[PDB]
């Protein structure tokens, strides 16, 4: 599924990402935009054999188990397939554990490169929430 | 599957450092976030803190920086050190993973001049 | 810190009857509210995560609802094994905090 910008903002607010561990809602909408372009089925195979899954491109090396990645650690204790659903529940749950690490949202390369330091609030502006 | 178990002294003196160990069996400590929680005599629970995958720690400000949570991969154990304890630190201590799916059995530690 | 207030402090019920336990937060925490059960001489057991998400291995009679500042844990048809303490905990902001707990006893 490909979310509309406002559609995802509302969903993420419902999934408790409005001010989760010091990160305003705009951060998550922006991250999703540049990580997957709001596409829940997005996947990207990496050189280390790992794959990034879902709307928030969660990596199979540290966060989810897709059973095909070398030194997998499965920190989110969840199968990567669960992150490829039109239902963002699992992606949000795992993303919350990821951001609870000291590295914060810096785990998301696209967020770091295109959102951090910008007016992220703009991403939820003009939306019925 | 995963198993957690606390170990350490059950009686300590005021002003000393209370140290507990949580042994993890079933998977590597490098594969989860680990925490410490304690229950005071009044049935009051306090989340003490946790150490995540990057080694970063989060400590409850209530502990006024007397706490340290460390890990030992080789022994597949993590620890809790609480400095300058007082009778206010008497409680039942538990270790559990960040998700809250796996908990230790809990261990009572009494702080007393005796 | 975020303060969680649970009510009632104690609740007596006859097995077979249903009950609802309240937990309200001092500020909005979205859906980041979890429920734990704890019996004497035992470690807490996670019953519901993120306000209403079910947990594998937990009896289906337990359900959670709410968002923002008001949350409830419901038990459809209480069983004797359900008597004990119930605590809510928020993970929206550090430090994580627990409500004062609600004791469920047989009437």
Question: How would you characterize the overall build of this protein?
Answer:
The complex is a heterotrimer of chains A (129), B (114) and C (107). Chain A has one domain: Lysozyme (Orthogonal Bundle), CATH 1.10.530. In chain A, 30% of the residues lie in helices and 6% in strands. A three-stranded antiparallel β-sheet of chain A has the order 1-2-3. Chain A is globular. Chain B has a single domain, classed as Immunoglobulin-like (Sandwich), CATH 2.60.40. In chain B, a hairpin with a 4-residue loop joins strand 7 and strand 8. The radius of gyration of chain B is 13 Å and the shape is globular. Chain C has a single domain, classed as Immunoglobulins (Immunoglobulin-like). In chain C, 0% of the residues lie in helices and 50% in strands. Chain C is built from no helices and eleven strands. In chain C, the strands form two sheets. In chain C, strands 2, 4, 5, 6, 9, 10 and 11 form a seven-stranded mixed β-sheet that branches. A four-stranded antiparallel β-sheet of chain C has the order 1-3-8-7, with no helix packed on it. Chain C is globular and about 35 Å long. The chains are: A mainly alpha (129), B mainly beta (114), C mainly beta (107). At the B-C interface, strand 5 of B face strand 5, strand 9 and strand 10 of C. Chain A: Keywords: Allergen, Antimicrobial, Bacteriolytic enzyme, Disulfide bond, Glycosidase, Hydrolase, Secreted, Signal. Chain A: InterPro entries: Glyco_hydro_22, Glyco_hydro_22_CS, Glyco_hydro_22_lys, Lysozyme-like_dom_sf. Chain A: Monomer.
């Amino acid at each position: 599924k490909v979310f509309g910008r406002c559609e995802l903002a509302a969903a993420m607010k419902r999934h408790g990402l409005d001010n989760y561990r010091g990160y305003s809602l705009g951060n998550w909408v922006c991250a999703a935009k540049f990580e997957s372009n709001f596409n829940t089925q997005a996947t990207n195979r990496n050189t280390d054999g790992s794959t990034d899954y879902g709307i928030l491109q969660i990596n199979s090396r540290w966060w989810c188990n897709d059973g095909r990645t070398p030194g997998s650690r499965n920190l989110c204790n969840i199968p990567c397939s669960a992150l490829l659903s039109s239902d963002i529940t699992a992606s949000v749950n795992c993303a919350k554990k990821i951001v609870s690490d000291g590295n914060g949202m810096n785990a998301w390369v696209a967020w770091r490169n295109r959102c951090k330091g910008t007016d992220v609030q703009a991403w939820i502006r003009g939306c019925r929430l | 599957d995963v198993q957690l178990q606390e170990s350490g002294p059950s009686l300590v003196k005021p002003s000393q450092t209370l140290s507990l160990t949580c042994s993890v069996t079933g998977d590597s400590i490098t594969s989860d976030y680990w925490s410490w929680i304690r229950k005071f005599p009044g049935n009051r629970l306090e989340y003490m803190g946790y150490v995540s995958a990057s080694g970063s720690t989060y400590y409850n400000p209530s502990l006024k920086s007397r706490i340290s949570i460390t890990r030992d991969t080789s022994k597949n154990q993590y620890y809790l050190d609480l400095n300058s304890v007082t009778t206010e630190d008497t409680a039942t201590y538990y270790c559990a993973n960040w998700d809250g799916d796996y908990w230790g059995q809990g261990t009572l530690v009494t702080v007393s001049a005796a | 810190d975020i303060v969680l207030t649970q009510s009632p402090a104690t609740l007596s019920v006859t097995p077979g009857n249903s009950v609802s336990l309240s937990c309200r937060a001092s500020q909005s925490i979205g859906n980041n509210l979890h429920w734990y059960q704890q019996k004497s001489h035992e470690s807490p057991r996670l019953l519901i995560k993120y306000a209403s998400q079910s947990i594998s291995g937990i009896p289906s009679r337990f359900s959670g609802s709410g968002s923002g500042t008001d949350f409830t844990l419901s038990i459809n048809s209480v069983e004797t094994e359900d008597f004990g303490m119930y605590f809510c905990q928020q993970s929206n902001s550090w430090p994580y905090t627990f409500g004062g707990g609600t004791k469920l006893e047989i009437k």
